[PDB]
């Protein structure tokens, strides 16, 4: 067994649980992009760890969060590889499953330096099983990972809709702190099936692109960004917190008025994965009873310190490496 | 430890050595090839075992060949599942090497089914720093693989060319009988730096555009073969095979008139590694006594059966889905 195990008195039971994707990143240099037919060398191979789901939860697990990542892998080496980085990363995977008739997750990327373009290809594989039927018959119907004790529950948009919207449902309706990361972008159907779930979502917290997409308010901008937040607290979200790249955040407690803070001046290197650093690194700041202000702008800086350094989630810092009066 | 344990005494020492590649084919299935910038799901995924060194050892294993796989692959859970998928096949693990700087060795596939057009990128990973100063630092200078008892080495082209030449060299010199399938296709300075070894080939195995490139003969049919195989005996080969795809192969043993023998007549559904089958079915028949005609003749069997189901590795033959006297 590489995965953890539960006690039968629930002392390792985790403060924030994270519902979704882990996929291995298999990262080919080219010289150029392959043109049909074409067999070619890359110059040089990355392997990567990624989804959205595993980035948040290692990017809380990084800070010390006491998080564990619910998930469908492999009994492949990637998924046993999986599990052992995600230990290594302050990760509890006692709630990770694994199936014997599907691989690990992963995303086939192409890399052009001269050109700095991509080519990816996202192979889900296990993850297309990881359906609520399948969750409730491994979990007691949520049972095993909703306890009493748990205060945050993280969900994406890279596993099977209706896993998501059961999650978060089941945990609004027994006082967890629902945080749902509408990424990648739903799709107009995802949109009118997300819409009716919004009233069990504790924290919504998209980027501009995603709340365009759930509120139909064009969002560019601080000022159309407030209007994003209002029409959201009207769909019945809580709080909500916009992320807007190099330009910071907006956000709303509870329906008070609106903030912008803005973001990090730094030479961004890599931005890939800065999203994901941002909201477990938020929930993170959030567990140790800061509140949403206040963890967001802890957020921001942890998230402008991982867009100076390739690596998603080698980029994501440890508490050590942060400057004074971030922590 | 995955890898088998080789015994004081060496009493489950092999019969064939390939010295060579193993690569994890990661194949992904696409509605269209990926334009540059652009993020895509995949219709369907396939992890196959690949590297034309593995593919040659499983061909022989499958058919209950005494083979060991001479290779580095990763630390990796990737490097793990291709060892166990090994041993499953009849090879020998035990004189697989780990690193654990490198992933090992994979080619990122994508196959457009509707257009049936492919885009590859080959990361030989791992491969790379398979050198002959490593092999010799873990082989005791080839004592340790090169055993009196050994009677067959198999090499291809897919490994760093000064392993696969150094350890041609090597095993002849100690009275091994070494087989040399060019493949993939030797570059222009591969073929001068190739010529020079050929005195320590017993049996090249070249397929024709190989045969082409290395004798200057344009080599396209039966005839031109036949000039092919004069042109290699005359750079001191003993034993030569030219493979002709559906036209079968030609051959002469030890300078004897050259013999032509067709194809099977079969339904070609996917003839991928249908070469490797060809040429460790080709061994195993040699190592079971054999001459080279009558192992060549099975072997062309053996490779025909392949081309009538898809999966590489999944399509080579049995003993049981043999005609009567193969075997
Ligand atoms: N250039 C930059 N400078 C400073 N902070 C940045 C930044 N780019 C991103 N960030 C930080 O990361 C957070 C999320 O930004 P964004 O949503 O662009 O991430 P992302 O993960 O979508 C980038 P990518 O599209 O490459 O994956 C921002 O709110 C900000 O805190
Ligand atoms: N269409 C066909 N019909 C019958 N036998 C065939 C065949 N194609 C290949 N073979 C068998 O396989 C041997 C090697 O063929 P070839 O060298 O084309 O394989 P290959 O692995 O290079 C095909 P690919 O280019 O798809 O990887 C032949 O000598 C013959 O025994
Ligand atoms: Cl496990
Ligand atoms: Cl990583
Ligand atoms: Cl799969
Ligand atoms: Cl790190
Ligand atoms: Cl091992
Ligand atoms: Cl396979
Ligand atoms: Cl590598
Ligand atoms: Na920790
Ligand atoms: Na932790
Ligand atoms: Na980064
Ligand atoms: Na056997
Ligand atoms: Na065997
Ligand atoms: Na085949």
Not at 87 to 98: I, L, P, Q, S
Not at 148 to 159: A, H, P
């Amino acid at each position: 067994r590489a995965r953890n195990v539960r006690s039968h008195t629930g002392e390792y039971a985790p403060d924030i649980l994270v519902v979704g994707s882990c996929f291995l990143d298999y990262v080919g240099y080219v010289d150029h992009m392959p043109q049909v037919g074409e067999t070619m060398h890359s110059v040089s191979f990355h392997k990567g760890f990624g989804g959205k789901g595993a980035n948040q939860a290692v990017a809380a697990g990084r800070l010390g969060a006491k998080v564990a990542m619910v998930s469908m892998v492999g009994t492949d080496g990637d998924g046993s590889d999986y599990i052992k980085e995600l230990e290594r990363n302050g990760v509890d995977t006692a709630y990770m499953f694994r199936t014997g008739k599907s691989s690990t997750g992963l995303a086939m990327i192409l890399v052009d330096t001269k050109s700095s373009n991509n080519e990816i290809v996202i192979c889900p594989n296990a993850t297309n099983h990881f359906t609520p039927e399948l969750l409730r018959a491994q979990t007691n119907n949520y049972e095993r990972i909703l306890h009493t004790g748990l205060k945050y529950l993280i969900c994406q948009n890279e596993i099977p809709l209706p896993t998501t919207l059961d999650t978060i449902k089941e945990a609004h309706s027994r006082g967890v702190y629902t945080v749902f990361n509408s990424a990648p972008a739903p799709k107009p159907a995802e949109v009118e099936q997300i819409k009716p779930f919004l009233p069990y979502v504790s924290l919504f917290c998209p980027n501009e692109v995603e709340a365009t997409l759930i509120t139909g308010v064009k969002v560019t901008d601080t000022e159309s960004a407030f209007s994003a937040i209002k029409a959201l607290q009207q769909l019945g979200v809580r709080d909500v917190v916009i992320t807007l790249g190099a330009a910071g955040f907006v956000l709303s407690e509870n329906g008070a008025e609106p903030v912008h803070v803005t973001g990090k001046h730094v030479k961004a290197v890599d931005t890939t994965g800065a999203g994901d650093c941002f909201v477990g690194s938020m929930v993170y700041f959030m567990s140790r009873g800061r509140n949403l202000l206040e963890a967001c702008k802890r957020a921001n800086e942890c998230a402008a310190i991982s867009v100076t350094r390739k690596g998603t989630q080698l980029s994501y810092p440890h508490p050590s490496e942060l400057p004074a009066g971030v922590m």
